[PDB]
Amino acid sequence: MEDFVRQCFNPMIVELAEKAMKEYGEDPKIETNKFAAICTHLEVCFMYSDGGSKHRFEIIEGRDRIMAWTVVNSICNTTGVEKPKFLPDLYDYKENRFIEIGVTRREVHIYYLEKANKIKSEKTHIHIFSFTGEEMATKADYTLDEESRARIKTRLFTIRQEMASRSLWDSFRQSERA
Ligand SMILES: O=C(NCCc1ccccc1)c1nc([C@@H]2CCCN2C(=O)c2c(Cl)cccc2Cl)[nH]c(=O)c1O
Ligand SMILES: [Mg+2]
Ligand SMILES: [Mn+2]
Ligand code: NA
């Protein structure tokens, strides 16, 4: 599965995932399922931000902590929206709201509730994807057009199928916790 991650994801995504794991004392070569999950969430965040028009989204995920908060605090001062307690994943300039992106190996409704209870940021918009084409967004408001969403869901399904063809999926599928 370490080989799978390194050939499947772009090298900057892989480097970011490695850093994120090591910042919590985890070895990407050992906790390989976690390695893959972080890479997938990152790739989805980047795909999401490419989904609209140029300049529609600001990417917050994937930045070091100081720059990420400089972006958040800047947006809050420029648009007046409330400052979140946790770093979200994107800001949407069209809808003027932060977005929290979730990618789950379990079911989208359970993950949605968990995310909602965890952030408790009434104003942050939540959008969840699964590896089997399901999604769940706040107020059933999905932000992107169906073509963009289809691209994301299609990529997640491809990853899922690739893992399965290597007998890695069932270990990966059961590795997520609440
Ligand atoms: O922004 C995120 N993380 C900010 C930093 C952070 C770090 C720890 C706890 C809270 C926040 C973030 N994180 C996760 C999931 C659940 C929380 C951890 N995690 C990871 O992927 C993960 C990371 Cl980052 C590093 C090592 C191991 C893991 Cl398992 N899911 C998201 O959708 C998401 O946006
Ligand atoms: Mg995040
Ligand atoms: Mn997220
Ligand atoms: Na989070």
Author numbering: 1 to 178
The authors write:
The influenza virus RdRp is a heterotrimer that includes the polymerase catalytic subunit (PB1), the ‘cap-binding’ subunit (PB2), and the endonuclease-containing (PA) subunit. The essential endonuclease domain within the PA subunit is a particularly attractive drug target. The chemical scaffold for our studies is 4,5-dihydroxypyrimidine-6-carboxamide (DHPC), which was originally developed by Summa and coworkers (Merck, Italy) into the first-in-class HIV two-metal integrase inhibitor raltegravir (Isentriss)30.
Initial diamide compounds such as 6e (general structure 6: R1 = phenoxyacetyl, R2 = 2-methoxy ethylamine) showed relatively weak activity in the FP assay (Ki = 1.6 μM), but compounds such as 6f (general structure 6: R1 = 2, 6-dichlorobenzoyl, R2 = 2-phenethylamine) showed improved binding (Ki = 0.36 μM) for the amide series, although the potency was generally not as high as the corresponding carboxylate analogs. The difluoro compound (7b) was observed to be significantly more potent than the initial dichloro compound (7a), so the crystal structures of these compounds in the PAN active site were obtained to investigate their modes of binding. Although the protein structures, including the two metal binding sites, are nearly identical, the R1 group of 7b adopts both cis (44%) and trans (56%) amide bond conformations; while 7a only adopts the trans pyrrolidine amide conformation. In the cis conformation of 7b the difluorophenyl group stacks against the metal-chelating heterocylic core, while in the trans conformations of 7a and 7b, the R1 aryl group extends into a pocket created by Tyr24, Glu26, and Lys34. Regardless of the cis or trans conformation, the R2 2-phenethyl stacks against Tyr24.
